[PDB]
Amino acid sequence: GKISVPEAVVNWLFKVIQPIYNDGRTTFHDSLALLDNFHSLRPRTRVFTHSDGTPQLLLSIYGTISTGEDGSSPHSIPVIMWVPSMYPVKPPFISINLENFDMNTISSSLPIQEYIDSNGWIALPILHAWDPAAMNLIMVVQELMSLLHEPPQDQA
């Protein structure tokens, strides 16, 4: 339950979430928890443009997710997660951040490679099977992390 973000960020979250989110309480709770669990992530609001051209200001959480120093070869991916205004009824959506990143620094051996489309959107299995009543933002990033991980050593 320890909070890693400073007061200015908590107050900011309080402020920006209110006007946008159908369920501000859950969005605030899940966003704060995410930031507290993944210290490389930061929040901002940005305009997301929908498929039909409609722009919508949304909370976005961004940063570089990296495998831990656990003896395995390190892998990192810069991502941008968007929280839709109907969260958690609707799932977040996540893309690779294409600044200073070449999507081709990701081994085809990495399980995550399979889920990244030509446009940079990451179709994580958890998002496809989203359960509004049982899932949160942390679980999304945890799955992302588990797919970045070097696949286990075998003896073949």
Next chain:
Amino acid sequence: QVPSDPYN
């Protein structure tokens, strides 16, 4: 509101 960023 317009876009904002407590870090930038």
